[PDB]
Design an enzyme around this catalytic site. Structure first.
Site, PDB file in Angstrom:
ATOM      1  N   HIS B 134       0.834  -1.140   0.007  1.00  0.00           N
ATOM      2  CA  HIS B 134      -0.046   0.007  -0.019  1.00  0.00           C
ATOM      3  C   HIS B 134       0.872   1.236   0.047  1.00  0.00           C
ATOM      4  CE1 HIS B 134      -0.022   0.335   4.728  1.00  0.00           C
ATOM      5  NE2 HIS B 134       0.994  -0.014   4.223  1.00  0.00           N
ATOM      6  N   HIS B 135       2.192   1.210   0.225  1.00  0.00           N
ATOM      7  CA  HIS B 135       3.036   2.413   0.044  1.00  0.00           C
ATOM      8  C   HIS B 135       3.548   2.941  -1.095  1.00  0.00           C
ATOM      9  CE1 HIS B 135       3.976   4.250   4.438  1.00  0.00           C
ATOM     10  NE2 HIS B 135       3.385   3.096   4.737  1.00  0.00           N
ATOM     11  N   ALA B 136       3.373   2.083  -1.917  1.00  0.00           N
ATOM     12  CA  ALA B 136       4.061   2.671  -3.370  1.00  0.00           C
ATOM     13  C   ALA B 136       3.324   3.970  -4.025  1.00  0.00           C
ATOM     14  CB  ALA B 136       4.084   1.233  -4.219  1.00  0.00           C
TER      15      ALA B 136
END
Lengths: 181, 388, 537, 301
Positions: B134-136
């Site tokens: 989810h951090h990309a």
């Protein structure tokens, strides 16, 4: 060798520094005003304001000398590491167009202000005549008061977070990674 | 009530260890699946394996240069890879490991396969633990996530559903999804994380989006060692209010062990029951739900709670007894399915949470080859031998 | 009230520089620069508590855009120009190209730090890294073993003519690309790995059996070494995991002395008093006389503390015998007199004015009572939890249980938990409990929750030393004597405490502190009032 | 009872390392036979390139020709003054009077031609602010790598009880918060009643963590600015006015005071309270007077 700059203009340079290094904002390349327009407005305004006793000759001489100085000094004293790849992408986008790129047609007057700010360092590092140095100082101060009276319509304080044109754009993540990485 | 749940497992998701002495590990999925079949949950749950994604099927959110980079990742020639490494943040904070391309391909395949299975209607709950990154970002690898498969899952859900809500319940919340859906009105992003000298450092009370996405991205900050009762108090009313007001058609659940009591860079103090009862409450609505997993610095604890989440999604109650599996040596001295909470200080005050509730309510009261597109293609995967 | 509004605002602000900042914000809205929302959110933090003043300002002014937070500022449209052939119109209208985030902007060019963990958590993390790496090695290797046994099973029933020519694409007919390359890079040399994978790709069925044998014996020795690692690894984990669970209890050995002092207690009580007085000065001139109240729902707790005391009488060696007898006697008398406990099964309103030594001793005893209340309230859950511990037989077969503390009888099974804790505290008072052992037993028995009793011997020694000062000091002996004289269990309140307060103000000096300890016989309620420097003014 | 001596195995040593089993046990007979690291052009770090006879380092971007590592030139790399010292105009046709004939050649730009000549005899570098711009603004100081650093930027402990944050060493009194008139120290018996507090970096104003929207402390980054002082950025929609303050100036003659008028002065902010950047002496009477005039003239609008 001493040069004075008005405190509003020094505020312009220090908030330029704040926007570049702290606030992470770089200059907007497709600005509506280029330095050639600034120098032309300077030359025509001071030619039509005063009389004609022969000052137009060295006026245009100083204009052309400052033009080629700004051409040959854009990336050698000015241009922080953040905007070096901006300059690189200007050069490659012009090399793909088979056109020699000049900084005069696309850059803003804030970098000219930076050059004016570092003018004492360049002057003291070179062997020059006294009369030419005082003439350059007088023309520099004349340009500074011209920028004083046109200070409202030239450097408009705007936030680029909500406006299309603010003579400044904001740094991206890949921009940071390739610049300061 | 009774709902069919699709579990997506890939035999090669854990085969790419990132490095040694390393927080992020996709290795937990294999003991998760071993506990899936060791608990006898396969008789009431169907399993399919998602195919790896291709170059163009990752192009709906990320740039072409990002896809080309992720195709040409090899640690051997990292000496000359310096312009593109830093541009997308790779090798400076997030090193290069072999076999990344297949990892992100199967991650995206599982994510949009769950989205397509949710859209078609074959299953009520889609579980893809193999990918929960989810951090990309669009052109940046941060938060140790390279492909944000949640964004393509959300837009694949939007291909059929009108409104889908994305949620995140662990620390180090995914800022990439909130960045991607910052201006749209039909996508709402909710975050359950902590702020203040933390790694992402993003997500504010005033951060509710701009333009058409105004008041469509809620972000509540928390503190160190929030207990289960205060997490229930911060979960249940905002969840019922966001179901009453926004009324989504699908929910993306980012389960993870990062919100558990034991963590490396985390700060939370929730046990398995606190992590599971909130999922039970949000599943009791009956709305279709997407489950993804991409967090956890510990390994035993996140494997245990994800096994419990699958058991809860199977509408059964799992016993505390832990049977024999090939991963039995991992767990603690008790050797039971029991994630023991720590004794962290509950600095999270009730009045701070109440003020957060008033601000959130005042913000949310105004809401009122492509040839293989649409997925719908997975292997049967009917023969597993992970049971012991 | 316009002519008295600025005076009231200046009185409420107090600090001069804060008044100049208020004046600057006042000008900022007054110079047509700030909007009404900015002034509203300024007075939200400025005069939020004063509801009357806030309503007055809202009615007088007449109060009835985008947030644009610090993060996610707008990108230029130059970066939006990007071909992106795999993006349709719906992706165009649900995704944005002019908003991007990056954590270094949130750090303001200062970096980030992680949460500090103790050494037991760090070594647990490192052994978890070892376990992950080693088990990943084993299982990727036997996945490659499965792949090799599958293609050998395919070539098992075919002739030499097709065995000589068996060219295959990368992947070995499977859905993975580089698991075999990675495992042969790990088990063989870096430069030899390229040539062996080239030989495997361009010529199978000749190099496959030998690498099968090498990888299979690698798995055999790997599993054997994992099995011989497992016993010591589990033994280390059994003693390090509960240490890693405890966070405040690890530092509680110093926290229980750092936070539990005298000057910290006067600081806490003065903070509570000044907070209550300032809140009342803001709200209403009368002040409450009840603050920091302790409830007493049980009576056997005092008996347990008496058991700890009379166990600690016979252990210390730096005290003379009748000094110990006298301190035990007055410690028993304090319970026999304060809470009207006429008889004890373990022995085999009212106003009290106190100085700081007796006050901190009473606060120590109330802290001990709170600790015993918190372990008693949840004792009835952990008792039945440990009564029916369903042991897993599979761990019993392989000897996997945590038998570190079961040889000498520290297990809590088959007995009451509170009685076992009382016996453990008595034996720790005796000083032969190898303190880490008691710490581990208390961690495992009630799930690391009751960290407050980890220094029971230390707080007992501190309370004994503080109770020793009850008779050595002449002033404390005097006020105990007049407390004996005052206590009569008769209706004499509301006309006798004034003389009591006057004489305890006269007999003690100015530097000593006064504490009003009000005790209620009904429902066992107490009230402690800070009345320092209120009568000599 | 950890035993890393006999149960240390033979195939695998301690992890995060390697050993000779991958080299010695690799039988496969199936094939049947002067420079610097400071980079004095922007005072930063990164990818470096260096010259053979020059002890100065440069990045790939801090050069007059911008060059990428993917297509870097082969052979020796030399700087601009390297081309000016050991190469042309100083080895053959040495700089005798080439400045004057250069002036004669370049159509009499002699008031700038000396700077054009000195451009070639100078290495490329980033812009650095001049020294005399630092003295007129004392609020901004040079950073480690040369970034903008004003007064907004700052120069069991880790959880648990921290009563030392509630106690100031200046007087030993109690830090009372602005919103709630309490410090709320709590007690050791009830740690949950305690609330974290912080002091301001400018006015030392105490504040609770529950009143203002804020999760934890501010230890790295810019100084913690409580929302009580003058904001650096304001916004009013009319396109808009930003008014990025004035960031203060020196005590010297550049600072000018002129107290003349108190009503309708049009000072647009930037005032100080007493008992070019034209600033005026401003008291409370003037402030409340212009406020009452303003909101009386603005009620009907």
């Amino acid at each position: 060798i001493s040069l004075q700059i008005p405190i509003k203009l020094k505020s312009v340079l220090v908030d330029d520094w704040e926007y570049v290094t702290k606030d992470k904002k770089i200059c907007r390349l497709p600005a509506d005003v280029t330095v050639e327009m600034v120098l032309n407005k300077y030359e025509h305004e001071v030619s039509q304001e005063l009389e004609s006793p022969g000052s137009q000759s060295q006026l245009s001489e100083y204009c052309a000398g400052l033009k080629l100085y700004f051409d040959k000094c854009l990336g050698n004293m000015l241009l922080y590491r953040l905007e070096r790849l901006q300059y690189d992408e200007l050069l490659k986008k012009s090399s793909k167009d088979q056109k020699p790129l000049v900084p005069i047609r696309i850059y803003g007057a804030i970098h000219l202000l930076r050059l004016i700010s570092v003018l004492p360092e360049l002057i003291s590092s070179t062997t020059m005549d006294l009369q030419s140095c005082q003439l350059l100082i007088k023309q520099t101060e004349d340009f500074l008061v011209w920028l004083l009276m046109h200070v409202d319509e030239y450097f408009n304080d705007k936030d680029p977070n909500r406006s299309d044109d603010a003579l400044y754009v904001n740094t991206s993540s890949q921009y940071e990674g390739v610049a300061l990485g | 009530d009774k709902r069919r749940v699709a579990y997506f497992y890939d035999a090669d998701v854990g085969n790419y260890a990132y490095g040694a002495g390393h927080p992020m590990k996709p290795h937990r999925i294999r003991m998760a699946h071993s506990l899936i079949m060791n608990y006898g949950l396969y008789k009431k749950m169907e399993i399919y394996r998602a195919k790896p994604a291709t170059k163009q099927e990752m192009c709906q959110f990320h740039t072409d240069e990002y896809i080309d980079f992720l195709s040409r990742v090899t640690p051997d020639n990292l000496e000359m890879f310096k312009r593109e490494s830093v541009k997308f943040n790779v090798g400076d904070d997030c090193p290069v490991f072999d076999g990344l391309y297949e990892y992100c391909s199967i991650s995206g395949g599982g994510s949009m396969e769950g989205a397509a299975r949710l859209n078609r209607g074959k299953c009520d709950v889609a579980v893809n633990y193999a990918g929960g990154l989810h951090h990309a970002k669009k052109s940046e690898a941060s938060g140790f996530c390279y492909l944000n498969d949640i964004v393509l899952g959300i837009i694949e859900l939007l291909r059929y559903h009108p409104r889908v809500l994305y949620i995140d319940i662990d620390v180090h919340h995914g800022d990439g999804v909130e960045e991607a859906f910052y201006t749209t009105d039909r996508v709402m992003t909710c975050s359950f994380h902590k702020y203040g000298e933390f790694f992402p450092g993003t997500g504010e009370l005033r951060d509710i989006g701009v333009g058409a996405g105004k008041n469509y991205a809620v972000n509540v900050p928390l503190r160190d060692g929030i207990d289960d009762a205060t997490y229930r108090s911060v979960f249940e009313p905002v969840i019922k209010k966001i179901m009453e007001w926004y009324q989504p058609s699908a929910v993306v659940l980012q389960c993870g062990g990062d919100s558990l009591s034991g963590d490396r860079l985390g700060c939370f103090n929730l046990s398995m029951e606190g992590h599971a009862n909130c999922v039970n409450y949000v599943k009791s609505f009956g709305i279709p739900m997407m489950v993804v997993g991409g967090g956890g610095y510990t390994m035993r604890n996140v494997a245990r709670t994800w096994c419990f989440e699958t058991g809860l999604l199977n509408n059964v109650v799992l016993d505390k007894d832990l049977p024999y599996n090939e991963y039995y040596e991992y767990y603690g001295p008790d050797y039971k399915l029991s994630v023991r909470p720590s004794n962290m200080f509950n600095v999270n005050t009730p009045e701070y949470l109440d003020k957060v509730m008033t601000n959130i309510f005042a913000n949310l009261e105004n809401t009122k080859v492509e040839e293989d597109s649409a997925e719908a293609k997975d292997t049967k995967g009917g023969s597993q031998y992970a049971r012991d | 009230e316009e002519v008295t509004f600025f005076e009231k605002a200046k009185r409420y602000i107090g600090n001069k520089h804060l008044y100049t900042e208020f004046l600057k914000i006042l000008n900022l809205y007054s110079q047509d620069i700030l909007d009404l929302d900015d002034l509203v959110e300024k007075v939200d933090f400025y005069l939020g508590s004063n509801k009357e003043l806030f309503t007055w300002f809202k009615n007088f002014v007449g109060y009835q855009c985008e947030a644009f937070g610090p993060s996610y500022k707008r990108l230029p449209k130059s970066d939006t120009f990007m071909p992106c052939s795999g993006r349709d119109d719906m992706c165009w209208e649900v995704l944005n190209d002019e908003w991007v985030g990056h954590p270094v902007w949130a750090s303001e060019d200062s970096g980030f730090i992680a949460h500090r963990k103790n050494q037991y958590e760090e070594t647990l993390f490192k052994i978890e890294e070892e376990r992950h790496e080693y088990d990943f090695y084993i299982e990727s290797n036997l996945r490659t073993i499965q792949c090799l046994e599958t293609i050998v099973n395919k070539i098992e029933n075919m002739t030499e003519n097709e065995k000589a020519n068996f060219k295959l694409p990368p992947g070995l007919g499977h859905t993975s690309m580089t698991i075999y390359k990675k495992v042969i890079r790990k088990v063989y040399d870096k430069e030899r790995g390229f040539e062996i994978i080239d030989a495997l790709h361009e010529h199978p069925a000749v190099t496959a059996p030998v690498v099968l044998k090498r990888l299979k014996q690698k798995d055999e020795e790997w599993r054997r070494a994992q099995r011989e690692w497992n016993k010591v690894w589990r033994e280390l984990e059994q003693k390090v995991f509960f240490k890693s669970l405890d966070h405040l209890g690890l530092t509680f050995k110093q926290a229980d002395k750092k936070l539990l002092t005298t000057k910290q207690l006067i600081s806490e009580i003065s903070s509570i008093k000044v907070d209550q007085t300032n809140k009342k000065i803001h709200w209403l001139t009368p002040k409450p006389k009840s603050q920091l109240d302790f409830d007493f729902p049980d009576k056997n707790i005092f008996y347990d503390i008496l058991c700890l005391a009379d166990t600690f009488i016979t252990h210390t060696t730096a005290y003379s015998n009748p000094d110990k007898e006298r301190l035990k006697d007055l410690l028993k008398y304090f319970i026999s007199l304060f809470f009207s406990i006429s008889f004890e099964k373990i022995e085999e309103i009212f106003n009290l004015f106190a100085n700081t030594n007796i006050y901190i001793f009473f606060r120590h005893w109330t802290t001990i009572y709170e600790r015993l209340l918190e372990i008693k309230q949840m004792n009835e859950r952990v008792t039945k939890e440990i009564n029916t511990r369903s042991t897993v037989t599979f761990a019993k077969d392989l000897d996997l249980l945590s038998s570190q503390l079961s040889e000498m009888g520290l297990d809590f099974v088959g007995e009451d938990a509170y009685k076992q804790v009382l016996r453990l505290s008595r034996r720790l008072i005796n000083g032969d409990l190898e303190h880490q052992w008691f710490e581990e037993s208390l961690r495992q028995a009630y799930n690391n929750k009751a960290f407050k009793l980890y220094t029971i011997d230390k707080v007992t020694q501190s309370l004994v030393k503080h109770a020793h000062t009850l008779m050595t000091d002449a002033k404390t002996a005097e006020i105990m004597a007049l407390f004996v004289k005052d206590r009569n269990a008769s209706t004499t309140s509301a006309k006798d405490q004034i003389i009591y307060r006057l004489q305890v103000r006269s007999h003690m000096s100015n530097t000593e502190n006064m504490f009003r300890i009000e005790f209620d016989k009904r429902t066992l309620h107490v009230s402690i009032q800070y009345i320092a420097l209120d009568d000599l003014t | 009872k950890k035993r890393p001596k006999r149960l240390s195995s033979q195939n695998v040593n301690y992890d995060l390392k390697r050993r000779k089993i991958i080299t010695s046990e690799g039988i496969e007979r199936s094939f049947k036979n002067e420079n610097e690291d400071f980079c004095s052009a922007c005072n930063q770090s990164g990818s470096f390139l260096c010259c053979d006879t020059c002890p100065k380092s440069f990045h790939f971007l801090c050069l007059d020709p911008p060059i990428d590592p993917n297509n870097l030139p082969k052979g020796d790399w030399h700087c601009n003054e390297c081309k000016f010292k050991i190469f042309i105009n100083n080895s053959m046709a040495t700089l005798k009077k080439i400045e004057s004939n250069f002036i004669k050649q370049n159509n009499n730009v002699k008031i700038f031609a000396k700077l054009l000549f000195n451009i070639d005899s100078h290495n490329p570098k980033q812009f650095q602010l001049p020294n005399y711009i630092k003295e007129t603004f004392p609020a901004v100081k040079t950073g480690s790598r040369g970034q903008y650093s004003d007064e907004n930027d700052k120069i069991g402990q880790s959880d648990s009880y921290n009563p030392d944050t509630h106690i100031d060493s200046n007087s030993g009194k109690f830090l009372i918060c602005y919103k709630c008139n309490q410090t709320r120290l709590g007690s050791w018996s009830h740690p949950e009643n305690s609330r974290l507090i912080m002091t301001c970096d400018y006015c030392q104003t105490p504040w609770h963590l529950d009143c203002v929207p804020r999760a934890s402390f501010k230890n790295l980054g810019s100084k913690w600015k409580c929302p009580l002082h003058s904001p650096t950025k304001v916004y009013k929609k009319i396109n808009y006015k930003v008014w990025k303050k004035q960031r203060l100036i020196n005590k010297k003659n550049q600072l000018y005071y002129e107290p003349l008028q108190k009503i309708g002065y049009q000072n647009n902010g930037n005032i100080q309270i007493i008992p070019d950047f034209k600033i005026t002496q401003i008291d409370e009477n003037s402030i409340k007077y212009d406020f009452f005039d303003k909101i009386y003239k603005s009620k009907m609008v």
